[PDB]
Structure 1
Amino acid sequence: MTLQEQIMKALHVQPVIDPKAEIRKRVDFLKDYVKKTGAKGFVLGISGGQDSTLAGRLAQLAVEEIRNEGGNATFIAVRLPYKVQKDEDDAQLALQFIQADQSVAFDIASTVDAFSNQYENLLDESLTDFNKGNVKARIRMVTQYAIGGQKGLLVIGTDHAAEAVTGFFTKFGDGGADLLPLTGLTKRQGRALLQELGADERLYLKMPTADLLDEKPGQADETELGITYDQLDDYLEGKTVPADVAEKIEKRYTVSEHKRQVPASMFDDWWKLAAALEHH
């Protein structure tokens, strides 16, 4: 069991998949979980990006099936821009594809700014662009849970293997959710499901970006990672990649284990086994 193989197993990666079958299993999962909780549906932030576009369509398909089976369910798609979003057009395109039961726009700027201003005033320092970025992600979580709390809906998370292996998400930000329909999927597999679902190609060819920085809006995930999704997917799907690349993927995986586990206690072994861990 090489590290690459342990990672593939831990992240539930399927080297080869059947898009129609994956969609069936993932829509079934959303239905099975919600039935267990007695919730009234789901809520999800739609950014115009690939992951939320796919997760959103799966959620709409799920509630429509729940209603067809005689149940009661609704899906609310939520736009969460910080001021004017650079790629609002792509978000609208995603909304057109998702065809959600309900959609609403919630500018998170006033909340994020109220916080940053207060921080600056009381801590005698300004938030670095990166840290304010994480505030944005966390406020998006807050917004989705508030709507979920008010309407009795579960919060959908968009985590998948290509993001999980690098711990490329904000802890308790977009990482905070109730259920994950995309777990185990590589980035390219995600595009494959989108194609099967008949999505406009602009929805899966668009460049992946967390778009949280004020000074570098729309920054490419790969620019930040120093690794391309092509390499990540190759690695995750069990293919051979340059020792150079493998080492970089594996070190990022091992140091971010804390983001894939519940808070650490003295009774947990994962952190003791880890040679090291990095939070900042």
Structure 2
Amino acid sequence: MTLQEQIMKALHVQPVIDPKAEIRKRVDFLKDYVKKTGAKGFVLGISGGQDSTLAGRLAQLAVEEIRNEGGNATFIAVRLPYKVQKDEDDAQLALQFIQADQSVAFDIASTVDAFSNQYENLLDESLTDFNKGNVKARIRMVTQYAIGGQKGLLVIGTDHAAEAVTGFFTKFGDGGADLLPLTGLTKRQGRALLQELGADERLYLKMPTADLLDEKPGQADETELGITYDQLDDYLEGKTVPADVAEKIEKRYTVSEHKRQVPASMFDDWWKLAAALEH
């Protein structure tokens, strides 16, 4: 059980998939969970990026099916830009593909800026571009839980294998959610579900980006990772990759275990077994 193999199991990566069937199980998952909770439906932030675009469509399929089955459900797609979003066009295009029951825009700037003006003031230092970026992510979570709490909806998270392995998300930010329909899928697999669902090619060929920085907006995930998604997917799918690559992915993975676990207490082992951990 090599480390790479241990990661594949833990992240529920299926080395080979039938897109149609995957879409089936994932849409089935949203329905079964929402049914167990008695929630009125779902809420998800659509960024124009591949993952939310895909999670979004799976959500609309779920609620429509819940309706045809004789139930009451709804999906609200929510645009959460900071001021004018660089790729607003792309988000709109994703919205055109999703066909959400409802769609609404909530600029988070007033909230974020209120917080950072307050921080700099009272703490006599300004938030670095990075930390400020994490504020944006977290405020996006607050917004989705606000709408969800008011309308009785579950918050869909877009975490998948490609982001989980490198722990590429903000703790309690986009990482905080109730339901994860993309769990286990590699980046290229996610694209394969979009193709099967007939998504405009522009929607899955777009450059993955968290777009949080004020000075490097739209920054390529890969540019921050130092690892391309071809590699990550290769690794996750069980293929072989340059020892150079494997090792980097494996260290990023082990140092981010805290992001894939609930808060550590003295009764947990994962942090004890761990060589190190970086926050």
Please report the TM-score for the alignment, with normalisation by the length of structure 2.
Answer: 1.00
Shift of 1:154: 0.1
Q: SS of 1:179's equivalent? A: coil
* Cα shift readout 1:87-134 (whole Å, capped 9, x = no counterpart): 000000000000000000000000000000000000000000000000
Measured in 2, the distance between the counterparts of 1:30 and 1:260 equals 21
Q: SS of 1:180's equivalent? A: coil
* Cα shift readout 1:144-182 (whole Å, capped 9, x = no counterpart): 000000000000000000000000000000000000000
Measured in 2, the distance between the counterparts of 1:109 and 1:127 equals 15
Unaligned runs of at least 5 residues, structure 2: none
Shift of 1:20: 0.2
* Cα shift readout 1:45-85 (whole Å, capped 9, x = no counterpart): 00000000000000000000000000000000000000000
* Cα shift readout 1:19-66 (whole Å, capped 9, x = no counterpart): 000000000000000000000000000000000000000000000000
Q: SS of 1:31's equivalent? A: helix
Shift of 1:2: 0.1
Q: CA RMSD in A?
A: 0.3
Shift of 1:184: 0.1
Measured in 2, the distance between the counterparts of 1:79 and 1:244 equals 39
* Cα shift readout 1:212-245 (whole Å, capped 9, x = no counterpart): 0000000000000000000000000000000000
Measured in 2, the distance between the counterparts of 1:25 and 1:147 equals 27
Q: SS of 1:188's equivalent? A: helix
Measured in 2, the distance between the counterparts of 1:110 and 1:87 equals 20
Identity %: 100
Q: SS of 1:195's equivalent? A: helix
Measured in 2, the distance between the counterparts of 1:204 and 1:82 equals 23
Measured in 2, the distance between the counterparts of 1:224 and 1:71 equals 44
Count of residue correspondences: 279
Please report the TM-score for the alignment, with normalisation by the length of structure 1.
Answer: 0.99
Measured in 2, the distance between the counterparts of 1:87 and 1:262 equals 33
Measured in 1, the distance between the counterparts of 2:86 and 2:161 equals 27
Shift of 1:256: 0.2
1:73 paired residue number? 73
2:247 paired residue number? 247
Unaligned runs of at least 5 residues, structure 1: none
* Cα shift readout 1:163-213 (whole Å, capped 9, x = no counterpart): 000000000000000000000000000000000000000000000000000
Measured in 2, the distance between the counterparts of 1:229 and 1:117 equals 36
Shift of 1:276: 0.2
Measured in 1, the distance between the counterparts of 2:36 and 2:89 equals 37
- Deviation beyond 6 Å, 4+ runs, structure 1: none
